[PDB]
Design an enzyme around this catalytic site. Structure first.
Site, PDB file in Angstrom:
ATOM      1  N   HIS A   1     -18.485  -0.568  -5.913  1.00 49.40           N
ATOM      2  CA  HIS A   1     -17.619   0.367  -5.191  1.00 49.40           C
ATOM      3  C   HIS A   1     -16.821   1.280  -6.088  1.00 49.40           C
ATOM      4  CE1 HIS A   1     -18.421  -2.949  -2.383  1.00 49.40           C
ATOM      5  NE2 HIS A   1     -18.353  -2.037  -1.431  1.00 49.40           N
TER       6      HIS A   1
ATOM      7  N   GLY B   1      -2.017   1.371  -1.748  1.00 51.73           N
ATOM      8  CA  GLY B   1      -3.007   1.227  -0.698  1.00 51.73           C
ATOM      9  C   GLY B   1      -3.737   2.536  -0.421  1.00 51.73           C
TER      10      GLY B   1
ATOM     11  N   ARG C   1       0.387  -4.025  -7.542  1.00 57.03           N
ATOM     12  CA  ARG C   1       0.384  -3.312  -6.292  1.00 57.03           C
ATOM     13  C   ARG C   1       1.727  -2.566  -6.250  1.00 57.03           C
ATOM     14  NH1 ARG C   1      -0.038  -2.090  -0.979  1.00 57.03           N
ATOM     15  NH2 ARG C   1       1.530  -2.901   0.479  1.00 57.03           N
ATOM     16  N   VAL C   2       1.671  -1.305  -5.851  1.00 55.22           N
ATOM     17  CA  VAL C   2       2.869  -0.496  -5.592  1.00 55.22           C
ATOM     18  C   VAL C   2       2.704   0.072  -4.180  1.00 55.22           C
ATOM     19  CG1 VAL C   2       3.472  -0.126  -7.999  1.00 55.22           C
ATOM     20  CG2 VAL C   2       1.828   1.455  -6.900  1.00 55.22           C
ATOM     21  N   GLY C   3       3.435  -0.496  -3.228  1.00 54.53           N
ATOM     22  CA  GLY C   3       3.179  -0.136  -1.848  1.00 54.53           C
ATOM     23  C   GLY C   3       4.397  -0.225  -0.983  1.00 54.53           C
ATOM     24  N   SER C   4       4.195  -0.187   0.330  1.00 57.31           N
ATOM     25  CA  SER C   4       5.351  -0.373   1.206  1.00 57.31           C
ATOM     26  C   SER C   4       5.153  -1.539   2.160  1.00 57.31           C
ATOM     27  CB  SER C   4       5.695   0.924   1.939  1.00 57.31           C
ATOM     28  OG  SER C   4       4.645   1.325   2.785  1.00 57.31           O
TER      29      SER C   4
ATOM     30  N   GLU D   1       3.271  -6.716   5.043  1.00 57.53           N
ATOM     31  CA  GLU D   1       2.300  -5.765   4.482  1.00 57.53           C
ATOM     32  C   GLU D   1       0.895  -6.363   4.655  1.00 57.53           C
ATOM     33  OE1 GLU D   1       1.481  -6.331   0.332  1.00 57.53           O
ATOM     34  OE2 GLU D   1       1.153  -7.999   1.756  1.00 57.53           O
TER      35      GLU D   1
ATOM     36  N   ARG E   1      -2.068   8.598  -2.477  1.00 63.59           N
ATOM     37  CA  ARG E   1      -0.888   8.220  -3.241  1.00 63.59           C
ATOM     38  C   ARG E   1      -1.263   7.826  -4.685  1.00 63.59           C
ATOM     39  NH1 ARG E   1       3.235   7.568   1.154  1.00 63.59           N
ATOM     40  NH2 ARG E   1       4.419   6.116  -0.149  1.00 63.59           N
TER      41      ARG E   1
ATOM     42  N   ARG F   1     -16.404   6.597  -1.874  1.00 65.00           N
ATOM     43  CA  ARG F   1     -15.707   6.404  -0.596  1.00 65.00           C
ATOM     44  C   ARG F   1     -14.372   7.156  -0.535  1.00 65.00           C
ATOM     45  NH1 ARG F   1     -17.673   2.117   2.887  1.00 65.00           N
ATOM     46  NH2 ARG F   1     -19.511   1.131   1.934  1.00 65.00           N
TER      47      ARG F   1
ATOM     48  N   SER G   1       9.526   0.720   4.497  1.00 63.70           N
ATOM     49  CA  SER G   1       9.229   1.942   5.227  1.00 63.70           C
ATOM     50  C   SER G   1       9.927   1.980   6.590  1.00 63.70           C
ATOM     51  CB  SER G   1       7.725   2.120   5.384  1.00 63.70           C
ATOM     52  OG  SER G   1       7.239   1.090   6.200  1.00 63.70           O
ATOM     53  N   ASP G   2      10.299   0.802   7.114  1.00 68.91           N
ATOM     54  CA  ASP G   2      11.037   0.687   8.362  1.00 68.91           C
ATOM     55  C   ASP G   2      11.490  -0.751   8.587  1.00 68.91           C
ATOM     56  OD1 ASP G   2       8.679  -0.607   9.107  1.00 68.91           O
ATOM     57  OD2 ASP G   2       8.544   0.355  11.057  1.00 68.91           O
TER      58      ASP G   2
HETATM   59  O1  HPA Z   1       3.754  -4.114  11.022  1.00 71.90           O
HETATM   60  C1  HPA Z   1       3.116  -3.911   9.981  1.00 71.90           C
HETATM   61  N1  HPA Z   1       2.014  -4.695   9.746  1.00 71.90           N
HETATM   62  C2  HPA Z   1       1.403  -4.625   8.513  1.00 71.90           C
HETATM   63  N2  HPA Z   1       1.877  -3.790   7.532  1.00 71.90           N
HETATM   64  C3  HPA Z   1       2.954  -3.020   7.742  1.00 71.90           C
HETATM   65  N3  HPA Z   1       3.604  -2.150   6.956  1.00 71.90           N
HETATM   66  C4  HPA Z   1       4.631  -1.649   7.663  1.00 71.90           C
HETATM   67  N4  HPA Z   1       4.627  -2.200   8.896  1.00 71.90           N
HETATM   68  C5  HPA Z   1       3.596  -3.064   8.970  1.00 71.90           C
HETATM   69 CL   LIG Z   2     -20.461   0.831   6.688  1.00 70.54          CL
HETATM   70 CL   LIG Z   3       0.759   0.422   0.767  1.00 72.86          CL
END
Ligand code: HPA
Ligand SMILES: [Cl-]
Ligand SMILES: [Cl-]
Ligand code: HPA
Ligand code: HPA
Ligand code: HPA
Ligand code: HPA
Ligand code: HPA
Ligand SMILES: [Cl-]
Ligand SMILES: [Cl-]
Ligand SMILES: [Cl-]
Ligand SMILES: [Cl-]
Ligand SMILES: [Cl-]
Ligand SMILES: [Cl-]
Ligand SMILES: [Cl-]
Ligand SMILES: [Cl-]
Ligand SMILES: [Cl-]
Ligand SMILES: [Cl-]
Ligand SMILES: [Cl-]
Ligand SMILES: [Cl-]
Ligand SMILES: [Cl-]
Ligand SMILES: [Cl-]
Ligand SMILES: [Cl-]
Ligand SMILES: [Cl-]
Lengths: 231, 231, 231, 231, 231, 231
Positions: free
Chosen positions: B3, B19, B86-89, B177, B23, B42, B201-202
């Site tokens: 991949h 992810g 990993r750098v994410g939210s 996450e 980004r 991809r 993120s929330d």
């Molecule tokens: O509710 C969620 N589920 C999975 N990942 C997330 N990242 C922000 N909100 C969510």
């Molecule tokens: Cl496929």
């Molecule tokens: Cl992410």
């Protein structure tokens, strides 16, 4: 509480938790001033004394998730205990885990069903209190005590015909004991701080035993880290 | 690898893992010098460049255990990657987890079956590399970046009618996450070092969204911690 | 929706669902007239155009149950999509599944925990919409496209040390992919129609790869069946 | 075989499988010429006769996965049976499933542990033989017999305090019976062809019973489809 | 009830439960006076007559948890049956279980999911009514009928590729049958008394069959114990 | 053995197993002649003395499956112990279980994962040794000690937020304790004889406590039954 014969205020905010009640006696008498035994129920001794003028308690837990769960639940709920520090041993399951290493558990895997009972299809990963862990880590580093931070396995069966410790070791797991998952899960569920600090009593897979001298030395280092992290 | 379209040596020893592949592009172009895109398969972009004269790669993972598992396995096995960050939210699931907090995950719970597939009756608790975590922690503390260390939940279903996040929050879990369990389990199984660093993120339970400004700010802090921890 | 940047009416009643967003672009540009890209979020492209004057959309899903679950849930709930047709590939796990065969999945097995999360002790068997399946079947038969109808395996781990595909093949399972269980379960839960149509990219157990020419040919047959079934 | 008292060649290549051995007698005597009873063991009757000069057998299975599993295994392994067609009834669990509808099961869900016994963490989705299903479908369509193709639930407990049929109905499941998962799984494991054809005996959730006349009519349609599909 | 065609009062307080309805006929005709057949539905015969002037019924159950569960539930709920005595056979799985031994089951293990459906993470251990068991035990001892008291395995699959009977035998389990777990669990859930009495039809692991004479003899002993315990 | 400090021959063929090591001391000193303490490790006392000139040992087990499993395994494997009799208490979970009743456990249910670890999809039902149970039963009956024979629940969590004791009581389960499943399973796996004899310390659901006098009385009855059954 049902299993602890103490009166209010007799147990400190910080409790050390060895598995063996005779090791609780040893720790309290050897390390603390002005010691009182607040519990003799089932001979699972608990003591309180001072370390540098700060109250510290030491409570035996017995072996296994179910036994520590009793003591931890009662300490938290009846005695409002804030900091819970298991001080115990484990069987190392990797060669790179050395006999002199003091282990600080970030988390623990388990074959206990206690979390599947609560969560069903969720794998609950218990988590040490980072503030306690970092203080213990700093304390070891300050004195040059060899210290390894990673995960352990909380086993229900000391004699397990279906043991997966081979595979657990390949996933990085450091050693096997019988308490941590319970301590970390219960403390967290009640907003308290927990940490497990462990010495290595042998290598389970090579059968190689640690010497009595090695054990005395590591035990003192563990207790010093436990205490120092805390003052 | 199947991949990833890179040649040997094109990917660094240290890879950041957002992810979102867009980004990944943003991070590489914004933070690194002398950037090359080594993968377009991809449209899951991967880039390599330098940060203070040290090679750093940035590889999108997609969403979900199965998608990150592909990239992590190929990075480790085909490209001999050593450090995976990993750098994410995440969606915060507790009130005490503030919108400005940068989260360092010690471990993660999950409803993925990936570990029960391997271990059956064992709850496998994945574990961050402590050396990576401590460096990231030190880096935040040094600059005054608010940082919280604890656990997260790795979810299979972003829209989950049977969500247990209420109960998870009561057990101390910080946020939800879709990647961490896979990253931590796979890296550990192969003797590599991993860490997840997350912004908020929330708040999933209050529906309260973080502002675009708040997100830009936390994102930069996350990347700074990721990088600084590493140089 | 959270992950799709389209406006109302921009997505058709019928959506084709390749895993690879670059294959979504290829399909839309190659097969449809008057194409607009309605989504660029995360580079998971979605397009709408016409086929014989009927609106058709094409939306990449990414790899794995969790990633397709996001797109399928948003398509159904925010865009009122009625017909959802995965067009993808799989690794054949039986010798009798030939490289030229186009597979129509009646159902899928899985190691995803997504249905045990919902149903516990129940094995939920997802089910293709028979009207969609029969139209696709008729379309292949009409042109002489080799077609095989049976079941597939929806895998969480592309690289699985504990794979049961040997046993699955003996029970008649045709091939392994990473999306179908989610598509069929979610569409059915919301009263929509779904079908997965799959080409064979290799034989997993013999390692034998299909040629680039073979793949181009089967891909066109898959798309022709997908479209023709639908007009 | 242990449970069937037949001699070699006494059982046809094609066997119809009602649950009730008295309905096996009814079917054979009513529909077939030149009938012989080849089995009386446990009073679970099996008969062979001809339909338009082609040998057809009819074997009662009893109720439940474990009972049909016995008969199906012995038919396949001792008598080399090729085509196995359950002809039975089910309780409808949706309003849109009408009392006159003849159901052709593409697959079945279950609370039997029979597949978790074999596959552990895998949800095995059994699958009807498409050739048998399509012939039955064509046969109904040809005569105007109302026919519905979808999935059913194979239950272990006719009286189930923990029934999930409410949720199953919302996921599209048509009705509940006690045999299909076993028939489809065992036939497939041995490379034989199976199909379940079902009438509706009531609506489980409304308690509303089908009339004796309605049942006689649907039963004849089921048998006609079973036979016609086969000649 | 749905499956039993009896009128009120036609079934006795005490019902014997052979698996084979033809053995129900044999028992009633051979052992009881003034016999009436109260049920012919599905040819699963049920009879009532007298033994020493006390009413006793004999009801076939069919094979497997799901089939006996139907009859037991209807007997209890519609006919207010108080004592339920399975009289059947099992395959011995230990050498020390002799062909002449009459087995009284204290409990049974199972691979049926019926109790995990109700209890989830709990292993429910069904339990014979001790009063019934002790009377049966006394009755055997009084006449010198060899009798063994212990546990059995209730199997869903008579032909099981994944059988654990080797391990079950090492844990002390005496033999394998297909009914007991259901009988003991359902009777207990409704406050009725149950017991299973079993002869040995073979040794599953050595394939060694019991002779027709041996079986006739043990069958009569079983029935004598069943009856005598009861008068 | 690892946890028991005895020499060969110091432990009798018959061992009584209270949970509380201080109750082991009480029993030995109060009931037996010529007592020696053979174990002080962890303060889990074990004693041997004579009752009517027959050697009897008394070994504390601690609380919980994991703790008794240690002692039982070592007693069997290192000391060749033949008869293992838990003498303990339980919380009654039914009204019909009276405070004066002495309970003899035929079997036990559990939320411990110890048997699913060994058996996976099998529910293993542990089983008391019938010879031990019948002797104990006879002993009670002979003196008029009220005795109830049935099943108990072996719990991992004394404080369980997810307790199913309500449902367990409806299925006939008498009471809840923390040892029996382990004792019965381990003894049986090694060809030894086990029995649990239990007093009632309270009614868990009504919170109603048994008086100190009631407890002293029942305790003596339990010990008398344990001993008498054995001489
Ligand atoms: O509710 C969620 N589920 C999975 N990942 C997330 N990242 C922000 N909100 C969510
Ligand atoms: Cl496929
Ligand atoms: Cl992410
Ligand atoms: O093998 C063991 N199991 C549980 N705990 C232990 N502590 C040392 N060795 C072990
Ligand atoms: O082995 C595989 N796993 C999942 N999906 C696949 N598609 C082709 N091969 C595979
Ligand atoms: O409720 C039921 N359960 C199982 N099979 C059935 N067939 C009709 N109703 C039912
Ligand atoms: O192997 C068997 N399985 C179930 N029941 C039986 N009764 C005799 N043998 C068997
Ligand atoms: O509630 C309990 N749990 C476990 N053991 C007990 N013994 C008395 N009460 C209890
Ligand atoms: Cl203080
Ligand atoms: Cl310890
Ligand atoms: Cl272990
Ligand atoms: Cl470099
Ligand atoms: Cl969730
Ligand atoms: Cl249109
Ligand atoms: Cl796989
Ligand atoms: Cl023929
Ligand atoms: Cl039927
Ligand atoms: Cl049901
Ligand atoms: Cl009478
Ligand atoms: Cl039988
Ligand atoms: Cl079996
Ligand atoms: Cl002696
Ligand atoms: Cl006790
Ligand atoms: Cl409980």
């Amino acid at each position: 509480s049902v299993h602890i014969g103490a009166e209010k205020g007799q147990i400190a905010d910080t409790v050390l938790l060895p598995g063996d009640p005779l090791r609780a006696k040893f720790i309290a008498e050897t390390y603390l001033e002005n010691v009182e035994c607040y519990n003799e129920v089932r001979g699972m001794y608990g003591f309180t004394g001072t370390y540098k003028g700060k109250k510290i308690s030491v409570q035996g837990t017995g072996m296994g998730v179910p036994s520590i769960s009793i003591y931890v639940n009662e300490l938290i709920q009846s005695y409002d205990v804030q900091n819970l520090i298991r001080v115990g041993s484990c069987g190392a399951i990797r060669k790179d885990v050395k006999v002199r290493d003091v282990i600080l558990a970030m988390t623990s895997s388990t074959d206990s069903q206690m979390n599947r009972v609560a969560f069903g299809s969720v794998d609950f990963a218990p988590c040490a209190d980072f503030e306690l862990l970092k203080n213990a880590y700093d304390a070891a580093k300050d004195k040059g005590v060899p210290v390894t931070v990673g995960s352990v396995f909380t086993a229900d069966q000391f004699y397990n015909d279906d043991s997966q410790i081979e595979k657990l070791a390949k996933y990085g797991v450091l050693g096997v004991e019988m308490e941590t998952t319970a301590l970390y899960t219960l403390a967290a569920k009640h907003g308290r701080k927990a940490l497990s600090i462990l010495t290595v009593s042998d290598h389970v897979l090579t059968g190689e035993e640690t010497t009595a001298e090695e054990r005395q030395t590591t035990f003192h280092d563990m207790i010093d880290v436990a205490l120092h992290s805390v003052s």
